Curated annotation (Swiss-Prot):
Assembly mode: Consists of two polypeptide chains, which are synthesized as a precursor form of a single polypeptide.
Pfam families membership: Transglut_C, Transglut_core, Transglut_N
Chief location bin: cytoplasm
Chain sites annotated for binding Ca(2+) 1: A221, N224, N226, D227, N229
Protein name stated in the entry: Protein-glutamine gamma-glutamyltransferase E
Length: 673
């Protein structure tokens, strides 16, 4: 009889554990390139000295041998670089074979077939399929990361921390990456097959999937719905009807599944941190080390001149007159891999930004831009460096503009306000790691100034005031501020002060005026004076968005002297929302929990909905309609979860009602067994 395969044992458990891919929920064979995996092949008979077995693996719609998208290797006794199969042992009709792929093979879904040379003929049989990923464990992979604690953080951790807020107050929100949850690895893998790149040339695209630079750049474009039927639809208008408030999401799992579920239709709606969270899920899942970055006072330079303009009018109103803009904070990603296109000194952390801000080559893509390449001002390298350098170190010019005259005049120039407290989640804890010293030399140092000009080169007052917050700021309470002025001149002057308060979206989008007042006064030389600003709930609640932010502005003008702009954005807290466990948590055993919320308003809160999720704690997102809560009343929603994996797990919740959109809550649970 002719030689044939009776059956094949992929030893999925073993290989996956050895390939550090066992955390995935899938049942498939998940492997990482450049590493060996052993399989058992029971043949109908014993192997002959004159018989031969050729293994055939292929990926994508055009398996090409010369494109590395297809490979055919013989079963030998020795080993050959790249794909190869080695007969380690032969017992009975069972063959113990060790297969190995090349560290430079393309990632993605594969198909394995067998070609058998026996008794004068040749047969072929499909053997199965397995998924192939990047290998941060392999010293020769592009994505190699030597440190254990680090790799675990940037590849294996499915729970995260994203810093938000403003330079006056840094906060954080929990985010569920859920890269190991069901269908998540598959959906990400399917993204690469939906990109514009693939549609433009599937053959060349699948062949380029052996490069993290390519894969990351493709994801930076595909995670946003712009241009390619991507995943997320952005919206910074402050009104998200027909979708979900950008601040209500808690993870990437429901965003990616909804995407696949709605026939790859835009998921509405998202903002920078949502994009970053999803993009970061796509990366850690494919095997590319990654973390999320928050840059406070992020600038958006449009005319590539390393300068951003912000306008105001004589009345003290913020103005949306410039194509450029300064966000209170912007969140993006950093992938880890060697840049063989830039040179040995530019490998390491690379920047990837899926937020649709600037087009690159016509489409909304961004990265990779070596972070090392950014600090030295080498903006001539790919990709999108002039733009990225501008987010972290552009100069802020403040303009005065009176529309009644069409006149416009520079007010000042700040070369240190932009790019501050650049944070990322610490390794193995929730501590805030500041990586600013990584994106630039110290503000206020000659080097920072020297590099700025280097980069630019490649692309080419009697009164002083400060606004002081008084008492806590929380949605429902009144806001109290204090304009502090002082006359530093030897002369007694008369100063006119125009103040305004506008609710805003963190990106700077002005929403609506909630307060205004004027005040003329005479200050003597060295005399200090303070003006009280008071804004009731009634006034701002009407136009306050889920950002809970207000832009306070005071424009002080003294006769014949230039104007003086005193500015300060404030963040109003949400009435606390608490999470609590009602017993000790153990794997596969129910764990009782409860949500707690007190409504501080004199009016009830209706349309209450609770959202809970957490990788390893629940499967998906738990939705709960909450009964309307009266004024000063307390809500106590009970529910259970069933821990599926042990360790420090993250429980995230979202509480939304008519007077309080997206209140967040987070609890770190320790699951035993
Ligand atoms: Br290199
Ligand atoms: Br303050
Ligand atoms: Br604040
Ligand atoms: Ca897109
Ligand atoms: Ca500019
Ligand atoms: Ca600077
Ligand atoms: Cl290893
Ligand atoms: Cl999957
Ligand atoms: Cl770092
Ligand atoms: Cl946590």
């Amino acid at each position: 009889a002719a030689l044939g395969v009776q059956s094949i044992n992929w030893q999925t458990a073993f290989n996956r554990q050895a390939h550090h891919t066992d955390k995935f929920s899938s049942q498939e064979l998940i492997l990482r390139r450049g590493q060996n995996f052993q399989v058992l092949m029971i043949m109908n008979k014993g192997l002959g000295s004159n018989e031969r077995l050729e293994f055939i693996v292929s990926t994508g719609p055009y398996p090409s041998e010369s494109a590395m998208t297809k490979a055919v290797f013989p079963l030998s006794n020795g080993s050959s670089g790249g794909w190869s199969a080695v007969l380690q042992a032969s017992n009975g009709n069972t063959l113990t074979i060790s297969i190995s792929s090349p560290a430079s093979a393309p990632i993605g879904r594969y198909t394995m077939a067998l070609q058998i040379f026996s008794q004068g003929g040749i047969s072929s049989v499909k053997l199965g399929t397995f998924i192939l990923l990047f290998n941060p464990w392999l010293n020769v992979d592009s994505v190699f990361m030597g440190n254990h604690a680090e790799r675990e953080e940037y590849v294996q951790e499915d729970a995260g921390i994203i810093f938000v807020g403003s330079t006056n107050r840094i906060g954080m929100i929990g985010w569920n990456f859920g890269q190991f949850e069901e269908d998540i690895l598959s959906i990400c893998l399917s993204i690469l097959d939906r990109s514009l790149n693939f549609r433009r040339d599937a053959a060349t695209d699948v062949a380029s999937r052996n490069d993290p630079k390519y894969v990351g750049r493709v994801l930076s474009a595909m995670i946003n719905s712009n241009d390619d039927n991507g995943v997320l639809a952005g919206n910074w208008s402050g009104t998200y009807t027909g979708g979900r408030d950008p601040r209500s999401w808690d993870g990437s799992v429901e965003i990616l599944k909804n995407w696949k579920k709605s026939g790859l239709s835009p998921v509405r709606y998202g903002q920078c941190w949502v994009f970053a969270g999803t993009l970061n899920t796509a990366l850690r899942s494919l095997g590319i080390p990654s973390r999320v970055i928050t840059n406070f006072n992020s600038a958006h330079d449009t005319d590539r001149n390393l300068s951003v303009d912000v306008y105001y009018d004589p009345m003290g109103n913020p103005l949306d007159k410039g194509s450029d803009s300064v966000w209170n904070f912007h969140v993006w990603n950093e992938g880890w891999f060697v840049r063989s296109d830039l040179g040995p000194s530019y490998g390491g952390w690379q920047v990837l930004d899926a937020t649709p801000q600037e087009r690159s080559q016509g489409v909304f893509q961004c990265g990779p831009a070596s972070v090392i390449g950014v600090r030295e001002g080498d903006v001539q390298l790919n990709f999108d460096m002039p733009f990225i350098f501008a987010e972290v170190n552009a100069d802020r010019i403040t303009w005065l503009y009176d529309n009644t005259t069409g006149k416009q005049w520079k007010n000042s120039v700040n070369s240190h306000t932009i790019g501050r407290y650049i944070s990322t989640k610490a390794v193995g804890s929730n501590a805030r790691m500041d990586v600013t010293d990584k994106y630039k030399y110290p503000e206020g140092s000659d080097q920072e100034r020297q590099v700025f000009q280097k980069a630019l080169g490649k692309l080419k007052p009697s009164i002083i005031g400060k606004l002081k917050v008084a008492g806590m700021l929380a949605v429902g309470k009144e806001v109290n501020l204090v304009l502090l002025l002082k006359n530093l001149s030897r002369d007694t002057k008369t100063v006119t002060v125009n103040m305004t308060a506008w609710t805003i979206i963190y990106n700077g989008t002005l929403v609506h005026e909630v307060w205004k007042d004027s005040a003329t006064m005479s200050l003597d030389p060295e005399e200090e004076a303070e003006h009280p600003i008071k804004i009731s709930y009634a006034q701002y609640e009407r136009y306050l968005k889920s950002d809970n932010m207000i832009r306070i502005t005071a424009v002080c003008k003294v006769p014949d002297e230039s104007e003086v702009v005193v500015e300060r954005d404030i963040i109003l807290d949400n009435p606390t929302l608490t999470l609590e466990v009602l017993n000790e948590a153990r794997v596969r055993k129910p764990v009782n929990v409860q949500m707690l919320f007190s409504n501080p308003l004199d009016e009830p809160v209706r349309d209450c909905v609770l959202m809970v999720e957490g990788s390893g704690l629940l499967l998906g997102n738990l939705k709960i309609d909450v009964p309307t809560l009266g004024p000063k009343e307390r809500s106590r929603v009970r529910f259970d979860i069933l821990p599926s994996r042990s360790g420090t797990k993250q429980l995230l919740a979202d509480f939304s009602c008519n007077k309080f959109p997206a209140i967040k809550a987070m609890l770190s649970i320790d699951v035993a067994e």
